[PDB]
Amino acid sequence: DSIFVKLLKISGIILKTGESQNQLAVDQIAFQKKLFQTLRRHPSYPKIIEEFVSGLESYIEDEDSFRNCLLSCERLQSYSKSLIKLLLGIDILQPAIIKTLFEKLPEYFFENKNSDEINIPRLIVSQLKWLDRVVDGKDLTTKIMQLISIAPENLQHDIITSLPEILGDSQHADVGKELSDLLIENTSLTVPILDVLSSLRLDPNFLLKVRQLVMDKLSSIRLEDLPVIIKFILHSVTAMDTLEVISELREKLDLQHCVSSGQSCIILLFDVIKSAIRYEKTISEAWIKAIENTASVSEHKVFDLVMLFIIYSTNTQTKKYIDRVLRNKIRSGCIQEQLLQSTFSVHYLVLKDMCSSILSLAQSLLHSLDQSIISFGSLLYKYAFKFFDTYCQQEVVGALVTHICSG
Amino acid sequence: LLKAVQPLLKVSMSMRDCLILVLRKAMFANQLDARKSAVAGFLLLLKNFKVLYNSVANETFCLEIMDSLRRCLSQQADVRLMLYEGFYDVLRRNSQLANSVMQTLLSQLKQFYEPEPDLLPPLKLEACILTQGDQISLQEPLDYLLCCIQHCLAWYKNTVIPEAFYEDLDDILESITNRMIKSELEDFELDKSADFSQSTSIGIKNNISAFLVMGVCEVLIEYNFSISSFSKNRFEDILSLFMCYKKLSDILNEKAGKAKTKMANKTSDSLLSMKFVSSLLTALFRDSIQSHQESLSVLRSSNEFMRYAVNVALQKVQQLKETGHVSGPDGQNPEKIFQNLCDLTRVLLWRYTSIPTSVEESGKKEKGKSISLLCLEGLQKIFSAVQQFYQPKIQQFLRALVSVTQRTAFQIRQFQRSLLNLLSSQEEDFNSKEALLLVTVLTSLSKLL
């Protein structure tokens, strides 16, 4: 009936009632360009957009019709993107659409998961994701940050986790500042900010500021939050603050106050460490040399050796620097059994995967002289065989009989 | 990696849809290599995925990709650049897209184009710059863009036709060229209103704008030359363009004469294809055709121009010695490069041999940068670069100009007698350098005998 639904029908899309996923009679870009060019060739090209938006907003006043305008379109030639996203790529309707889209949503902050357990705020933010074009960022920037400021904890948290695909290089840095105003506002809300900010283009100076605003609040935290925090920290460092921050961190931590969410989130911490150690050698070599330089004090702890094993497994190339560091380390009356005991007593699930890493170390130890070497390499086998799988045990004995027949 | 892989992704749909998924997760990432590898992957899809399995399964899909690339175009400069560089390759491999592809860049230009004549600074140059927190940066390399446009469009007219975008673009570039002739650096606010202070945000901006300007001019030079069957008004226009270009270059020499010589950004590579340069020297030195000659007598006059348009071939071959590749179109199809190196060698031999240094009429200042000398310098660098890279095609090299050796000896003797004449002539101020690199040439040549 209306210019809205009629030009939908013309452009190759069917508008259904509000019970089922809408259809489309042509390809997506065919429909989009037919709509665009048809409005352009239609006279009063500026003011037909007003009739379009008025017809649409008058149509989506029903909850289910609104939801079906938002739901995926049904393809014949068999699913595609929704109607509303196929209008959101259209740059000329774009600002008015974004305005009205942000406008009515505060009717729904209590009418959440209405019919089929669908977060309509999550539906309406999920309209704005992987936008292949943005026409005005700063109007959206003002709107998004104020609409986050009004929103509840869980919903705005979900919105926070979905921003950086939406945002452009026009509007990263400024929102970096406003997010620190949100960072300070709540202790409940500190971590998904770090997720976002880690995933953004921001200057290293504000990044270093917020890095210190994290690092002062390291030991004042639960475990749940630390891998996503630490991931951010692992890609917050410079090339020059590497030794200082590794030392700062390593001396500051507990890993033991937290000690079945504990071992699970420590595995995720270590996965974050595995993702950052792999290529950023400016941090991995920084770490190796940050601990070899703290070989003086024999009070260096589980984390120092866990990292030795992980990094020895990780980098094929930096194996022998680790090898030589440990052969000097062991000799000083440093690394001893009791560390290895608790290491394999609690931090076993991480090294459970790194069986052959341990075994290679052991094999490389038992070859040489200095019975301290040989003693420690044997203790390694013992505890490694003890706490690990039957596959690990099978592997161990294989390796042992090999050292026997061979060496 | 993906050059290797993709023949898998002809077959698989799951891996294809996981790759493209990762490419569209990467363009919105913080680390820089995400954006660029995302573009790279995209273009390679766009390349080999079809020529135009069902074609209806691919066209829509590649269009979807290019709708995605309109995002990257909203991102930092080099990500735009990489597109602009790749698109000629795309079209040579995948013609059917042209009607779309042009528009993608046309609209990209239209944020800068000012289509009202009697407006002199005919582009928006404060759209190609970004200032925030007193950090001042380039965005939208317009120069490379125009280069892309020119190349694609010429190729279009060449092969595609044997439809309104390009019939417009003709008159677009025409109006741009005319406006460019009579914009005299105070529509750009240059040289006196600013002093290219690398300290000040404004002098920085000036530096950048100027580089862009010169690049623009270079492309327009290529276009004006390409259009005509050697019509004289366009050649006068080329000379005036070049006169403004050189004016800018010597402004920077004034500005680069004061500070220490770590501004090696002045030698920013030209936006002229190897191809066009080959064709240009071919037409300067081995053209006696009266029907064209009235125009060429205009360029042949302006020596500065003639030495610009050699220094280029030097920058191109020097790119070929430092890297395996050059910047332009067909800048990695090595046979194209081997063609263009042969067709430089040919002309420079013609020039150097026929016309030695002792016919000079310039004097002491240009005697430190005389032209025949630079023809020879390029010859030294070519011979060096070939023996390095195109070893097996050396018999092919020379039939241009029987074994390897007779060809080699006949080439040698020209330099040999040249240097002998050089020594026998004088002892007062004999051209040290000429001798030095004649010897160097012979050195290179030796290593085939």
Side-chain angles (χ1 to χ4, degrees):
Chain A
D1 53 295
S2 186
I3 189 171
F4 158 66
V5 59
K6 283 206 310 309
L7 184 52
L8 259 70
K9 290 150 48 51
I10 292 159
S11 57
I13 174 160
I14 300 96
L15 194 75
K16 285 194 293 189
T17 75
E19 184 266 323
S20 48
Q21 58 182 4
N22 300 326
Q23 321 91 304
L24 182 73
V26 291
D27 269 307
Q28 295 184 52
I29 309 98
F31 150 65
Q32 285 183 78
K33 75 174 289 200
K34 263 152 65 192
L35 186 152
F36 178 75
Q37 77 197 10
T38 301
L39 288 172
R40 264 286 298 287
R41 299 153 186 180
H42 196 288
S44 175
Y45 156 66
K47 200 54 54 174
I48 188 161
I49 311 315
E50 272 60 26
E51 301 192 41
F52 206 104
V53 293
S54 289
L56 167 52
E57 69 191 0
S58 53
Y59 156 69
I60 60 170
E61 272 155 22
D62 204 41
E63 174 161 298
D64 279 32
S65 89
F66 167 78
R67 189 209 67 181
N68 285 272
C69 202
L70 292 167
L71 277 153
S72 55
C73 304
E74 169 61 43
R75 187 68 177 126
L76 283 69
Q77 312 192 39
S78 290
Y79 311 125
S80 63
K81 303 157 71 203
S82 169
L83 158 58
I84 281 163
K85 184 55 146 215
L86 284 158
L87 265 54
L88 211 66
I90 316 191
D91 302 322
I92 58 161
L93 283 72
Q94 197 160 302
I97 289 172
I98 290 292
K99 154 170 161 194
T100 189
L101 194 71
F102 275 54
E103 190 64 29
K104 63 183 163 284
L105 182 63
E107 300 148 32
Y108 300 81
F109 299 163
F110 295 102
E111 286 60 57
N112 285 313
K113 278 73 69 176
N114 51 78
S115 62
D116 57 305
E117 299 294 84
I118 58 169
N119 184 10
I120 285 283
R122 200 68 173 157
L123 277 292
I124 199 169
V125 72
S126 182
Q127 304 303 316
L128 316 178
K129 297 279 280 301
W130 291 305
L131 298 156
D132 299 351
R133 274 224 68 189
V134 169
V135 298
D136 52 85
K138 314 314 304 200
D139 187 21
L140 172 144
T141 307
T142 52
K143 285 188 187 291
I144 194 164
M145 284 304 278
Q146 69 188 359
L147 207 155
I148 290 155
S149 304
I150 68 176
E153 188 71 4
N154 50 3
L155 268 61
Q156 86 198 344
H157 195 295
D158 303 319
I159 300 305
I160 286 281
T161 61
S162 52
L163 301 168
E165 304 300 320
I166 319 174
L167 282 178
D169 287 276
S170 49
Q171 49 171 358
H172 283 310
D174 58 314
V175 186
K177 316 193 311 310
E178 296 171 290
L179 290 160
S180 283
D181 301 326
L182 277 296
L183 190 87
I184 64 172
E185 193 149 354
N186 316 284
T187 192
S188 68
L189 186 69
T190 303
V191 308
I193 285 162
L194 289 168
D195 196 315
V196 165
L197 292 177
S198 191
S199 38
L200 298 199
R201 305 286 286 253
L202 305 171
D203 59 42
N205 58 71
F206 166 48
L207 181 57
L208 182 44
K209 178 179 180 181
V210 66
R211 191 263 280 286
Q212 187 55 277
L213 298 192
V214 170
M215 177 47 95
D216 59 339
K217 324 188 188 177
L218 182 144
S219 301
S220 78
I221 315 298
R222 83 194 74 197
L223 175 52
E224 302 194 326
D225 302 315
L226 302 177
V228 300
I229 286 164
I230 283 150
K231 179 76 156 200
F232 152 77
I233 296 156
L234 286 162
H235 305 244
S236 71
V237 73
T238 67
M240 309 212 277
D241 210 326
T242 53
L243 292 198
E244 192 283 321
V245 75
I246 292 166
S247 51
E248 182 84 24
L249 169 68
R250 182 161 51 69
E251 214 164 16
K252 199 162 302 320
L253 289 154
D254 43 13
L255 289 163
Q256 292 156 129
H257 293 219
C258 50
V259 191
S260 188
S261 195
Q263 68 207 3
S264 308
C265 191
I266 284 159
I267 290 154
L268 287 206
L269 163 65
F270 279 108
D271 265 338
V272 158
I273 294 158
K274 288 169 184 70
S275 69
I277 62 180
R278 211 79 56 72
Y279 315 108
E280 297 169 304
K281 269 52 163 163
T282 311
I283 298 152
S284 111
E285 275 79 326
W287 205 296
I288 289 160
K289 295 180 53 51
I291 285 167
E292 88 189 13
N293 285 23
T294 321
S296 76
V297 63
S298 193
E299 193 75 15
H300 64 65
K301 299 299 294 184
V302 163
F303 195 52
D304 300 70
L305 301 89
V306 183
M307 282 296 103
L308 271 166
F309 300 126
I310 292 165
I311 299 160
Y312 175 95
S313 62
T314 299
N315 274 319
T316 303
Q317 307 313 310
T318 197
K319 273 169 175 167
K320 315 321 304 169
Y321 199 47
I322 296 156
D323 188 304
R324 190 72 211 81
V325 157
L326 184 56
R327 271 172 166 70
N328 282 324
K329 169 60 72 65
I330 193 176
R331 276 177 184 186
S332 77
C334 307
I335 291 160
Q336 313 96 323
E337 159 48 12
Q338 71 282 16
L339 286 83
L340 202 73
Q341 189 276 322
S342 34
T343 287
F344 283 84
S345 88
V346 187
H347 296 188
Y348 46 91
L349 303 177
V350 187
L351 317 188
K352 187 176 68 164
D353 293 343
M354 305 182 195
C355 48
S356 198
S357 185
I358 300 154
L359 309 200
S360 55
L361 285 167
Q363 163 158 38
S364 183
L365 295 198
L366 302 199
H367 297 332
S368 87
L369 279 294
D370 181 22
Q371 180 48 232
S372 57
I373 284 176
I374 296 157
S375 169
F376 193 53
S378 41
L379 281 149
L380 207 64
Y381 274 113
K382 284 174 184 182
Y383 300 116
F385 187 100
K386 261 199 220 173
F387 306 108
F388 284 13
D389 206 307
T390 49
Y391 155 65
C392 201
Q393 289 148 38
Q394 162 157 20
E395 181 57 279
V396 164
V397 169
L400 272 176
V401 179
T402 295
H403 308 335
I404 289 165
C405 314
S406 67
Chain B
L1 179 50
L2 299 157
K3 283 185 197 289
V5 165
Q6 282 189 142
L8 191 156
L9 300 176
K10 295 182 183 161
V11 171
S12 182
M13 301 294 120
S14 58
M15 220 166 287
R16 175 267 303 258
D17 286 338
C18 182
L19 175 57
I20 297 139
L21 167 54
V22 176
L23 299 194
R24 205 178 292 92
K25 288 148 42 178
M27 306 193 292
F28 315 86
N30 59 342
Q31 63 182 357
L32 311 189
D33 299 291
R35 319 298 186 76
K36 331 217 186 179
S37 302
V39 167
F42 273 125
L43 296 207
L44 291 144
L45 296 180
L46 296 196
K47 279 180 196 188
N48 78 329
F49 194 72
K50 194 154 185 303
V51 193
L52 293 81
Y53 207 86
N54 306 315
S55 88
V56 295
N58 316 130
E59 57 195 1
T60 177
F61 160 79
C62 303
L63 289 155
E64 205 199 61
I65 283 164
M66 214 178 330
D67 203 278
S68 314
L69 297 173
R70 293 175 228 160
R71 180 63 170 186
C72 267
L73 280 154
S74 95
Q75 298 192 307
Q76 72 190 116
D78 303 27
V79 186
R80 311 200 184 152
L81 188 142
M82 285 161 39
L83 276 148
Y84 297 153
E85 288 201 338
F87 267 112
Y88 179 80
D89 257 278
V90 175
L91 302 209
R92 198 157 81 273
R93 194 195 302 283
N94 197 337
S95 66
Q96 276 66 0
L97 305 182
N99 293 260
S100 164
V101 173
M102 294 287 186
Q103 309 265 338
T104 320
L105 300 166
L106 198 154
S107 58
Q108 190 90 7
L109 179 48
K110 289 280 189 177
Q111 316 198 45
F112 312 95
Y113 194 43
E114 307 188 331
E116 46 277 13
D118 195 15
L119 179 54
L120 221 50
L123 324 168
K124 185 43 57 198
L125 282 79
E126 293 83 339
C128 312
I129 313 158
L130 189 143
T131 301
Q132 83 292 29
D134 203 359
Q135 297 187 310
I136 295 91
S137 58
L138 163 62
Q139 68 206 341
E140 212 281 299
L142 176 60
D143 43 4
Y144 290 94
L145 171 56
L146 285 167
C147 193
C148 161
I149 295 153
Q150 205 272 285
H151 299 323
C152 305
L153 207 165
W155 169 94
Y156 177 88
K157 295 171 157 169
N158 290 358
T159 196
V160 168
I161 288 162
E163 62 86 24
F165 54 91
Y166 77 94
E167 281 165 22
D168 193 20
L169 280 155
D170 302 346
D171 302 281
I172 296 288
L173 289 171
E174 279 187 344
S175 181
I176 293 156
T177 303
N178 287 264
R179 292 148 77 184
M180 209 58 53
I181 288 159
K182 57 221 180 167
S183 313
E184 302 84 352
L185 309 173
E186 283 79 72
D187 311 307
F188 305 86
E189 306 97 19
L190 308 172
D191 186 29
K192 299 284 95 164
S193 57
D195 293 329
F196 297 87
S197 38
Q198 56 249 30
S199 66
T200 74
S201 56
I202 322 171
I204 285 159
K205 181 198 174 165
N206 274 88
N207 188 241
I208 292 164
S209 61
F211 294 167
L212 190 49
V213 165
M214 292 184 300
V216 169
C217 302
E218 286 181 26
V219 183
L220 296 157
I221 292 155
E222 196 163 8
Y223 185 38
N224 293 123
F225 185 99
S226 69
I227 290 154
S228 81
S229 73
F230 312 110
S231 293
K232 314 181 222 199
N233 314 279
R234 290 144 200 184
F235 283 50
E236 169 50 40
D237 296 350
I238 287 161
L239 180 53
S240 67
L241 273 169
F242 168 65
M243 282 155 34
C244 170
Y245 159 71
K246 195 75 183 170
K247 178 176 184 180
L248 284 151
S249 193
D250 60 58
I251 286 154
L252 292 167
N253 282 269
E254 293 161 354
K255 301 303 185 189
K258 324 175 309 316
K260 263 292 201 178
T261 182
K262 297 294 136 291
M263 290 277 159
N265 64 344
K266 180 172 287 178
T267 65
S268 293
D269 62 12
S270 285
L271 328 185
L272 311 189
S273 35
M274 186 80 76
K275 195 74 184 273
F276 160 75
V277 172
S278 154
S279 294
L280 191 79
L281 305 198
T282 294
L284 285 181
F285 301 157
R286 281 157 65 85
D287 199 338
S288 51
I289 309 166
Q290 298 302 311
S291 66
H292 323 316
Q293 185 58 56
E294 66 277 49
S295 51
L296 317 187
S297 53
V298 185
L299 306 183
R300 287 166 186 201
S301 74
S302 180
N303 299 292
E304 288 165 12
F305 183 73
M306 303 276 267
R307 83 185 61 164
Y308 171 71
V310 165
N311 280 297
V312 157
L314 265 54
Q315 280 178 64
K316 300 286 145 160
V317 167
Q318 181 72 101
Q319 284 165 177
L320 198 76
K321 249 177 68 199
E322 283 155 26
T323 80
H325 61 71
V326 306
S327 51
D330 275 300
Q332 297 88 54
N333 191 237
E335 281 66 4
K336 293 280 178 215
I337 311 162
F338 182 59
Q339 279 298 119
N340 277 319
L341 292 168
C342 309
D343 308 354
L344 286 152
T345 320
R346 188 179 299 112
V347 62
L348 295 161
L349 283 173
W350 186 92
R351 157 66 181 215
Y352 186 72
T353 319
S354 302
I355 312 177
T357 307
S358 90
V359 306
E360 57 86 20
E361 64 290 342
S362 297
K364 304 317 208 190
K365 222 184 194 301
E366 315 190 12
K367 264 177 184 180
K369 52 163 175 278
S370 160
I371 289 144
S372 190
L373 177 87
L374 312 189
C375 292
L376 191 55
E377 184 175 308
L379 271 168
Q380 186 258 302
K381 278 161 169 218
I382 288 154
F383 281 128
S384 214
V386 166
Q387 276 192 90
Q388 186 173 335
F389 282 80
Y390 295 80
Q391 192 70 194
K393 298 169 220 151
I394 284 161
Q395 184 58 299
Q396 312 185 4
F397 190 99
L398 297 164
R399 299 204 187 166
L401 322 186
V402 181
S403 86
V404 165
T405 294
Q406 296 90 353
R407 308 280 167 192
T408 327
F410 166 60
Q411 298 316 311
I412 287 157
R413 293 155 164 290
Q414 305 157 334
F415 307 108
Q416 214 161 292
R417 73 191 63 178
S418 194
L419 175 51
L420 278 178
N421 154 57
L422 195 153
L423 296 164
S424 45
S425 54
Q426 74 185 328
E427 198 63 84
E428 42 261 31
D429 63 355
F430 69 99
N431 206 326
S432 168
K433 297 174 187 174
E434 189 149 22
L436 204 154
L437 52 102
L438 274 163
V439 162
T440 323
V441 163
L442 288 162
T443 314
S444 313
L445 278 155
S446 66
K447 317 209 170 182
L448 311 176
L449 308 176

